[PDB]
Design an enzyme around this catalytic site. Sequence first.
Site, short mmCIF file in Angstrom:
data_model
loop_
_atom_site.label_atom_id
_atom_site.label_comp_id
_atom_site.label_asym_id
_atom_site.label_seq_id
_atom_site.Cartn_x
_atom_site.Cartn_y
_atom_site.Cartn_z
N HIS B 79 -29.14 -13.97 -24.96
CA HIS B 79 -28.52 -14.65 -23.72
C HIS B 79 -28.35 -16.20 -24.52
O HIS B 79 -28.77 -17.25 -23.98
CB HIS B 79 -29.67 -14.85 -22.88
CG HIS B 79 -30.17 -13.62 -22.22
ND1 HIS B 79 -31.14 -12.89 -22.92
CD2 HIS B 79 -29.78 -12.86 -21.41
CE1 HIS B 79 -31.40 -11.75 -22.40
NE2 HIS B 79 -30.38 -11.53 -21.21
N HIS B 83 -22.76 -14.84 -25.94
CA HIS B 83 -22.87 -14.37 -24.78
C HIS B 83 -22.17 -14.80 -23.41
O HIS B 83 -21.28 -14.24 -23.00
CB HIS B 83 -24.27 -14.02 -24.35
CG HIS B 83 -24.38 -13.35 -22.89
ND1 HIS B 83 -24.08 -11.86 -22.66
CD2 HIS B 83 -24.98 -13.76 -21.60
CE1 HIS B 83 -24.24 -11.83 -21.45
NE2 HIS B 83 -24.83 -12.86 -20.92
N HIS B 117 -23.58 -19.11 -16.43
CA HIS B 117 -24.57 -17.99 -15.83
C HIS B 117 -25.81 -17.85 -16.54
O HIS B 117 -26.66 -17.42 -15.91
CB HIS B 117 -23.75 -16.79 -15.63
CG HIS B 117 -23.98 -15.67 -17.15
ND1 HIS B 117 -23.24 -15.74 -18.25
CD2 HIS B 117 -24.72 -14.65 -16.87
CE1 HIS B 117 -23.75 -15.03 -18.97
NE2 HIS B 117 -24.47 -14.09 -18.27
N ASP B 118 -25.93 -18.21 -18.06
CA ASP B 118 -27.05 -17.77 -18.58
C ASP B 118 -27.89 -19.06 -19.29
O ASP B 118 -28.61 -19.14 -20.15
CB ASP B 118 -27.10 -16.73 -19.51
CG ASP B 118 -27.47 -15.34 -19.21
OD1 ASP B 118 -27.96 -15.17 -17.99
OD2 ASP B 118 -27.09 -14.42 -20.11
N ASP B 228 -21.00 -9.64 -16.98
CA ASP B 228 -22.37 -9.92 -17.66
C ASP B 228 -22.65 -8.53 -18.77
O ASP B 228 -23.19 -9.00 -19.73
CB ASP B 228 -23.29 -9.77 -16.66
CG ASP B 228 -24.56 -10.61 -17.09
OD1 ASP B 228 -24.63 -11.29 -18.06
OD2 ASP B 228 -25.63 -10.89 -16.35
N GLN B 280 -29.41 3.46 -24.89
CA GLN B 280 -27.89 3.02 -24.46
C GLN B 280 -27.57 4.27 -23.41
O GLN B 280 -27.00 3.70 -22.38
CB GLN B 280 -27.26 2.96 -25.92
CG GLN B 280 -27.48 2.03 -26.91
CD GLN B 280 -27.68 0.58 -26.22
OE1 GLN B 280 -26.87 0.05 -25.78
NE2 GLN B 280 -28.84 0.28 -26.58
MG LIG Z 1 -28.70 -13.74 -16.74
ZN LIG Z 2 -25.78 -13.06 -19.09
#
Ligand SMILES: [Mg+2]
Ligand SMILES: [Zn+2]
Lengths: 327, 324
Positions: B79, B83, B117-118, B228, B280
């Site tokens: 994160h 990313h 967002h992160d 995301d 996965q």
């Molecule tokens: Mg997040």
């Molecule tokens: Zn994220």
Amino acid sequence: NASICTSEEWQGLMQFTLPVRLCKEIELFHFDIGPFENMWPGIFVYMVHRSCGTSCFELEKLCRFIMSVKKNYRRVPYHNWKHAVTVAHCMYAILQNNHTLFTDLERKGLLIACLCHDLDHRGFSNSYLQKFDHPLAALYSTSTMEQHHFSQTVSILQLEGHNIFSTLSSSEYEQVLEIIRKAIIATDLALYFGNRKQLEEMYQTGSLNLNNQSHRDRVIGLMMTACDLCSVTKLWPVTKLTANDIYAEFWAEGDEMKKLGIQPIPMMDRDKKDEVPQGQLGFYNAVAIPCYTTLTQILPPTEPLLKACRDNLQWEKVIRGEETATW
Amino acid sequence: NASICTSEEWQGLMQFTLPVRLCKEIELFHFDIGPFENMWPGIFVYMVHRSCGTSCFELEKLCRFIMSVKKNYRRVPYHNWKHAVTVAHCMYAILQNNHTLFTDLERKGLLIACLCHDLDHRGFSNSYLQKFDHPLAALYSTSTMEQHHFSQTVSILQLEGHNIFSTLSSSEYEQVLEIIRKAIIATDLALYFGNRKQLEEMYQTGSLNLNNQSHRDRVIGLMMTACDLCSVTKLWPVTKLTANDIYAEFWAEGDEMKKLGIQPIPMMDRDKKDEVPQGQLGFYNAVAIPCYTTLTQILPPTEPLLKACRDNLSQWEKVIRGEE
Ligand SMILES: [Mg+2]
Ligand SMILES: [Zn+2]
Ligand SMILES: CC(=O)Nc1nc2ccccc2c(=O)[nH]1
Ligand SMILES: [Mg+2]
Ligand SMILES: [Zn+2]
């Protein structure tokens, strides 16, 4: 009593063409239909055409048949449209690997029986219907839902422009309806125990003869069980996700039972989820493993189903506390 | 507690021009920013300029905003800033292929929301924070990290010469901040399941109406999830090296259990990686495939994301079966 597809539904299916990369994939026993939802009716057309031929059924009647079968499956967590296509794909892979052991009539009959084998399922077991004295249990004293599924198939076949078997002789038609009736009825697990034990005896004593109709009916019966349970033959994360669906359906029935003043078996009790891994180990030892073991003995090209089932019997690793991440 | 950027940082970004060789490559959904570390803030400026126009933000303020946002990303394994830009590029490709569906306010809101967002992520899931009783859980009760990431975004926008939206009317600023809050919140995976289920019903029954704000909000939310998770939509050599990402939060918590002298259960233990390819497959089938399927139904030009996700799913199957 049978729902009917729209013209838009069957017309759209007539146009569908299977992507090139899937053609290789669909032949494999381990193939998981899960990520190709929009392609499910289209995948069944493809399997019917490769196994039976493009001129075996009238395209419009078959596309109307497929889409009305899709409409006659309920929005239940497990005995749904996805399960029907999954079971049909497993039949296809057994048929492609043992093609000449089966006549054209049996092949079209078995692929159609697999697609329809759980038609109109309500998310309720034979145990429920027979205890709560439901009209279906009075109508069908034994293999309750399985007789109802067969009745539903006949009802879809009887719809306008849905009779895919119309082009057969009155004898062959009666022969295919019987192949389908016995195959759908053989999906009642209560019948599997006796069928498997008999086949094991016939095979071990070397009396098993695939030209003896009573023997063929049994081998077909075991193929129906094998296809019906085929979630246990997929790669582990696929197997595990389907097991959540099966239990979601079992727990909803346990819930309905409680409201009616009867307490359910542990498997149907959502408050007994901790007992699930041991219950799966029990199901694999008592049902799945013996099924695929006997089926591999009779039809050696089905060996990968047994290998994949032994691999999932993962449930041992779960019991020992070595399981992996869920999402 | 928001961080600002140096004069040298925002100025150097203002001089940046994307190399021509990347002009068509960047338009592709499968585009990998991986080999272009030095260009990441520049790629974002390029995307905003192409999607929103050069007259959208005062260059200097925008370059200042971006460099502070980068600052505010910790050196965590997943994160992180890489990313953030990967997520923003996926939003750029969705927005560009659906050029007529989104308003000017939505396009600027969404690209900024994706970059932010992160913000200030610490490598922990919302599960861990309200388990090991971390201070952030005491601050934010539900969607803990997401509420914090938006807190951090408002925190940056309120810094000197950083309010990139100061050029908007009283209501337009309220509109944009709401888009951003809703969009960052929608990145809580726990909220995705219920959102996607509702959208499936709407699309199938024909009740899906993009004129309806709550319907736009839901569709935007699914787009945020799609962006995301986009590492699953890259070409195989890029995706094959991304196997450990979905496990980063389980292993962060296990590391904390290891700090209490507790050998954690195998799923939380980073030394137990044999189940990674199977994990996965499970994530693709339970999370990513449904996301991209529902997204393609609502927005057909997004189909390449679904195709690439399906392609990688097939590659993960081959790894498990021992065929590659
Ligand atoms: Mg997040
Ligand atoms: Zn994220
Ligand atoms: C405990 C038990 O009966 N489990 C069970 N597990 C299953 C797993 C896959 C397919 C079918 C079944 C099934 O019928 N039962
Ligand atoms: Mg059944
Ligand atoms: Zn079944």
